[PDB]
Amino acid sequence: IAAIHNARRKKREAAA
Amino acid sequence: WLPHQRKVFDFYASQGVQYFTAFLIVSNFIFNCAEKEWDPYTDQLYQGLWRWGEFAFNTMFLIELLINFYGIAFCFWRYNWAWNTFDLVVVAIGTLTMAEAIGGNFMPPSMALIRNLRAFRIFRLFKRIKSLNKIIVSLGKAIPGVANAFVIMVIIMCIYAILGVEFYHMTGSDGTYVTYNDNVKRGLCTGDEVELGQCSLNQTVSSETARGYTYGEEYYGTFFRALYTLFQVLTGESWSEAVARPAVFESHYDSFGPVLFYVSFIIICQIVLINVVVAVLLDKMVEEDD
Amino acid sequence: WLPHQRKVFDFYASQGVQYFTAFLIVSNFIFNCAEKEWDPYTDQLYQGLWRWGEFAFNTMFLIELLINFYGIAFCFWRYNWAWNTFDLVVVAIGTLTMAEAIGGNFMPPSMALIRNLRAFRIFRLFKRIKSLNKIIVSLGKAIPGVANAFVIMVIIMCIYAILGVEFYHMTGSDGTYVTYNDNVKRGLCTGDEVELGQCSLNQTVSSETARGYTYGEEYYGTFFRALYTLFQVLTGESWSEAVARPAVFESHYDSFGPVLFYVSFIIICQIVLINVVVAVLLDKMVEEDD
Amino acid sequence: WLPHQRKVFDFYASQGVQYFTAFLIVSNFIFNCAEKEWDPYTDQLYQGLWRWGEFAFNTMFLIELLINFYGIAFCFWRYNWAWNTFDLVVVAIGTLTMAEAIGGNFMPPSMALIRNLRAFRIFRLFKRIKSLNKIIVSLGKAIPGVANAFVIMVIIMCIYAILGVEFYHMTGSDGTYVTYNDNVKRGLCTGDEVELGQCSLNQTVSSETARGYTYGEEYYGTFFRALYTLFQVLTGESWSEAVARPAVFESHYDSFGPVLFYVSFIIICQIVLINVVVAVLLDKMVEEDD
Amino acid sequence: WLPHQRKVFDFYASQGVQYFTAFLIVSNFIFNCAEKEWDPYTDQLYQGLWRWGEFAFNTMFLIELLINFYGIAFCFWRYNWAWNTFDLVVVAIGTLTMAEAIGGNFMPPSMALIRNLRAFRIFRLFKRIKSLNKIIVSLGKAIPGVANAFVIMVIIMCIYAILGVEFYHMTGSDGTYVTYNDNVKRGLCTGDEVELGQCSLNQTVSSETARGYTYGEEYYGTFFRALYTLFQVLTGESWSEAVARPAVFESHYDSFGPVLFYVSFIIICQIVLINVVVAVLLDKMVEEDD
Fold it and tell me: Where residue C218 sits, what CATH number does that domain have?
């Protein structure tokens, strides 16, 4: 599920 | 423009009419499912039921298609061309099925694979329900990003397929391979019985698979057989007990070869490449979600 | 309504009483586990032990239910309706079990599946422990988000099930299918021995499964058998050696058919769809976590 | 304090001495690996080599332990108590092994599982290398977060184990279970041959496993056998061809029972629960990483 | 310094010439794939086709290499040393193949593994296509981060391999192990028939694998066999039905030993360690992506 986690991070950090 | 086009078009775009067509789509799919569940045989028991049910559903879908086109001036190039095209295709095949059922076998017995296209009418439900549409549009806008990692993984799989055909395409060709024990060294027999002939250090295990082949011919007999074997190994299915271990043990002191072959393939392709493909897929989908 | 309900209710809400009921729940579950571990047989050895233990536990749980309802004026519609309802159901079944044990077989031998509901008393522990509750509430608020991708995956699985019943539902119906050799071409025999009859290029491999069937009848005999086969393939269980490979090698020159069938199913459903379902699930859960 | 304690302690904390002890740890582990690779038998061929090598390594590790304790005033409660304790344990067992090798069998033949503790000396390497330490500390601070979801998953597994023992613990007890086919309805035989006795609709397939049991006794004979079966199903290992399918096809018309059993177990436990456990694990680890 | 080298160098670096070399690379790879698909046998049918095709491709790749080096003053140490080196190696082997095809067997029959290096020419395509290059550079800059968790996982696998060789390396050495059943206890027989001799509580199941071995010799006979067995268990392949269950049920009352062995291995290595390795891999790759 690492793929899911990474996508989640990228989305949030990019928004930040 | 057609004198009756506008109100008919905004009627076909109505919420209730779309929901009714959706109900009719799901009922037709359930009808096909039920045909395959309760009447799958060649010599069917209730043949008229499925035939006339498909007929009635095709008639209703044809009427829906005509109401659609009548509302868009019968053009369908301009407005919603993709779904209109798919609908036209499936209803054209349905009309072909009506003709086939009534007045002869218009199509050769070869291309019945097109009669089998009824199952794919359910895809029209994805247009009406905004959630399924959201999912499939994200999937479609995610696939091109996957293309690159997919091509890399396939390149590596074809490399391993060439290597596998060169190496193992004749493993067990006689139908049998020999594996050597450690009997005297372990304790199961004494060295004298071997030299006399009472025991042995080799077992002539047979190599036939449950498909009638030998290990080499089936798993790596050709390049596409080998590519399929490597797909089955990529998904983790019996890669050791069926594929790897007979190769690994067939060669007595050259066991590093097949072991490194399968271990390197599994590590690289399975772990790294599948996780990268799926990761870029989910990344693209979460991109489109937000 | 009741004279001392206000204090009885706040007594039942006490930390220690909830922890004691939790201890009693876990002890009852361990009692059922121990019954199945040390005394699973039909003709039990220590039958009175399990019977009277279930009796005592049901009595204590009934007393707990009465203390509960006595504290909420015996209504239980207003305050914590879900857990109160579940508790009422399980203790009602427990009282049925007490009656069944004492004064006759009140229930027909058919619906013992309801006596088996003792195992699910442990779910009442999830209410008291704030961590397990935290997990199951996140799961519950995550499942509706999954619903859409789940329905898409099931739609595709039923499509493939219809296709599979149409194609393979008669593979190996005789009990045997033929696979074709490359013996003359490889080197194992010379072409003359084949024409004379010493060797052959076909092997009449048998198709019976370890279930007594043929390959087609068991794996794709009907639509629900095929949907179950496709579930087993979706989880990756023996999809090649048991399901795919006999089909792939049954065909002489059209092995692209079954190969593309199973490869497309695996790619689409397994990789893309399972990872999307699990991804939206975990996304919803991390949403609720924060 | 000891008059020689300070400089000796700062000498044992030196970079080079720690790297040398690390080299010695890895060499001892490689020595054990090599013993098992080149000399695994009961009647070993080079017994003195492994014996005196373990002796020399134990001597060097004892000297290292004494240099350690001499530098911390021989207390080891105050400074780095965990690793000092583990080191004291392993070197104490090593000294026991020295005594055992020289002057008798001090330990009963029962607890050799403690002589097997040499393999775990390698864990001392994790203290010196800052990367492996960084990984295991994250793992340790991640496990308590997993505890909750793990307990939920185990609760559900025990529920399913009780259910499985109640249902299937006698499947195939005779050694054979009967399965029924649609022979007449499909076309393989005509209904008259069945009534006359030429064909049948039932096949008395045998239920013995490759361990010698019956299907029920081995897979769900008791509660711990059933819990182990459900673990094997949770990891996806032959859950259908070995576990599920004989149960599913044992029932004539109630195949919904076992199908729903295994499908619900797989969905819930495998997909949802394993992915939630692993997700909270990786979440905790990325928490500690940053 | 060549007189027209600068002009020549630009031509090599042109878009169209790189795309043409890429087309030529892909065509050569497809040629090798097609050789293995349509002509894999030892006694080939169209041998001249593949020979002269490899010859022509090697000639074109040699001309490309010479145009390359002529443009960089034939140095190739200073400009793009890695790909130039790889290209020089593969074309040197191709020239060796030309010589081998024309004027004798220059190489001993031993090292044909180097003639097999044609398949790896396709890697040169990764330099020209910016997407595949982007993927492989991320992979390369991600692997060193994985190194640590990989070394931890391998340390644990070798620990378990030593333990497995010590424990199970003689399981079923006779070729048979006995398993005990609760026939009298469960109801299948009465205790009197056992004491008389009509039934038994032990079944002498055989331990030979489909490789001709015994369970212990093949799966844990040595340390590298055990490390390979633990790799197959790490990937989840038949870890129970082939590896674990015969060990677990060989023991009469100490089934906790092998059960805890395999359960601890699976949990730790599979779940935690594989997910941590893959997680740090994908983390590093998303680092390089952004």
Answer: 1.10.287.70
Helix (H) or strand (E) holding B95: helix B81-103
Cβ of residue D125 closer than 8 Å to a chain E Cβ: yes
C92's CB contacts (< 8 A; 6+ apart) are: none
Residue C27 shares a structural domain with residue C94: yes
Question: A15: which chain B residues are within 8 Å (Cβ-Cβ)?
Answer: 290
* Helix residue ranges per DSSP H, chain D: 5-12, 15-38, 47-71, 81-103, 125-128, 130-168, 183-186, 191-196, 215-220, 223-234, 245-250, 256-265, 275-289
List the determination method. Answer: cryo-EM
Q: Are C148 and B132 an interchain contact pair (Cβ–Cβ within 8 Å)?
A: yes
Please list every residue in chain E whose beta carbon sits closer than 8 Å to the beta carbon of residue D125.
155
Number of domains in chain B: 3
Q: Report the alpha-carbon distance of residue B92 to residue B73 in Å, rounded.
A: 19
The interaxial angle of helices D275-289 and A2-15, nearest 10 deg, is 50
Residue E137 makes CB contacts below 8 A (sequence gap 6+) with E288
| Subunits close to E (at least 3 CB pairs below 8 A) | A, B, C, D
Asked whether the beta carbons of E54 and E24 are under 8 A apart, the reply is no
Distance CA B231, CA B225 (A): 10
Cβ-based contacts of C286 with chain A (< 8 Å): 8
Do B277 and B196 lie in one domain? The reply is: no
Tell me whether residue E5 is exposed, middle or buried, using C-beta atoms within 10 angstroms of its C-beta: 0 to 12, 13 to 18, 19 or more: middle
Q: What is the resolution of this structure in A?
A: 2.8
Q: Is residue C279 part of a domain?
A: yes
Determine the distance from the C-alpha atom of residue E151 to the mean position of all C-alpha atoms in its chain, rounded to a whole number.
Answer: 18
In order, the DSSP letters of chain E are: --TTHHHHHHHHTSHHHHHHHHHHHHHHHHHHHHHHHH--SSS-SSHHHHHHHHHHHHHHHHHHHHHHHHHTTTT-SSSSHHHHHHHHHHHHHHHHHHHHHHH---S-GGGGGGGGGGGGGGGGHHHHSHHHHHHHHHHHHHHHHHHHHHHHHHHHHHHHHHHHHHHHTTTTTTSEEEEE--HHHHTSS-HHHHHHTSS-SEEEEE---TTSS-HHHHHHSSHHHHHHHHHHHHTTSSIIIIIIHHHHHHSSS-THHHHHHHHHHIIIIIIIIIHHHHHHHHHHHHHHH-
Q: Which amino acid is at B286?
A: V
